[PDB]
Ligand binder design. Structure first.
Ligand SMILES: O=c1[nH]c2ccc(Cl)cc2c(N[C@@H]2CN3CCC2CC3)c1-c1nc2ccccc2[nH]1
Length: 273
């Protein structure tokens, strides 16, 4: 496949596959040939350009973009070793404080993409990988959405309930940076209390503190061990500000949410300080 050579499959979308490859280990994303019309293909090339311009340690470089000999659009990107952020933090038993530091780093990568006019649209643990580099947990944000609104509509869909914003779930036209903010909120909720956000009748989850308070003692013990804390300290630290921050990010109305990932970061730093 060009200067690049497929090793194994690592993902599928029904309208695209991702493979592990190599010249440097790469990801090679193939797009189904009938998924993008002339306009979608234009939009795809442009957004691929925008992505290629990002220079941030937490975002994969873009090596190549083209169309294969089967009519499929492709991109080659850096392959990032790592594990889903939530799973990684549990395995290495990070404190809330170390988790929030990683949240800042993830937020800084998403904020860098927003500033270059790029919105991810599918943030979730499997697209936010962590490894240890020079002793520190360092995140990698992968698999940005490209030309998602231009896809052949003749083709359980879209993103993941819980992470995807209500607007995206209602198939809305105006999906903006605030949708990534919602998804960060949902990820940060899980990092904080070890339980998924479940939107209740008013489209808002319980505060993390109340969520972990309701679960049985065995679930409670596991969550607290994975954060190197007692239940009572976990409950208090969440109540101290992480509840408010994650709930602001998870406001069902975009207008009531953080207006920017920059505003979310400021509140995370105020909690740490
Ligand atoms: O860089 C990667 N590293 C990984 C490491 C481990 C595993 Cl299991 C998957 C990926 C992985 N696939 C994810 C695993 N899962 C399915 C595909 C992808 C998102 C969630 C990517 C990746 N880099 C990409 C760059 C551009 C486009 C796609 C990309 N995928």
């Amino acid at each position: 496949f060009g200067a690049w050579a497929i090793d194994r499959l690592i993902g599928a979308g029904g309208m695209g596959q991702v493979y592990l490859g190599h010249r440097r280990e790469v990801a090679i994303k193939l797009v189904a040939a009938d998924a993008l019309d002339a306009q979608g293909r234009a939009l795809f090339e442009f957004e691929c350009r925008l992505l290629a311009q990002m220079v941030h340690p937490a975002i994969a470089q873009i090596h190549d973009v083209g169309t294969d000999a089967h009519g499929q659009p492709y991109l080659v990107a850096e392959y990032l070793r790592g594990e889903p952020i939530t799973w990684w933090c549990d395995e290495h038993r990070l404190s809330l404080h170390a988790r929030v530091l990683l949240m800042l780093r993830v937020g800084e990568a998403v904020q860098h993409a927003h500033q270059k006019g790029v919105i991810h649209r599918d943030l979730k643990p499997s697209n936010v990988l962590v490894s240890e580099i020079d002793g520190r947990p360092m995140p990698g944000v992968i698999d940005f959405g490209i030309a998602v609104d231009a896809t052949n509509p003749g083709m359980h869909d879209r993103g993941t309930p819980g992470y995807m914003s209500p607007e995206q779930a209602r198939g809305a036209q105006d999906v903006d940076a605030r949708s990534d903010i919602y998804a960060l909120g949902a990820m940060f909720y899980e990092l904080s209390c070890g339980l998924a956000p479940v939107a209740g009748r008013d489209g808002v989850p319980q505060p993390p503190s109340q969520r972990v308070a309701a679960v049985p003692a065995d679930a409670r013990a596991r969550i607290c061990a994975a954060r190197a804390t007692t239940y009572q300290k976990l409950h208090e630290q969440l109540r101290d500000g992480l509840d408010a921050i994650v709930l602001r990010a998870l406001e069902p109305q975009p207008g009531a949410r953080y207006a920017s990932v920059s505003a979310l970061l400021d509140d995370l730093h105020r909690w740490l300080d």
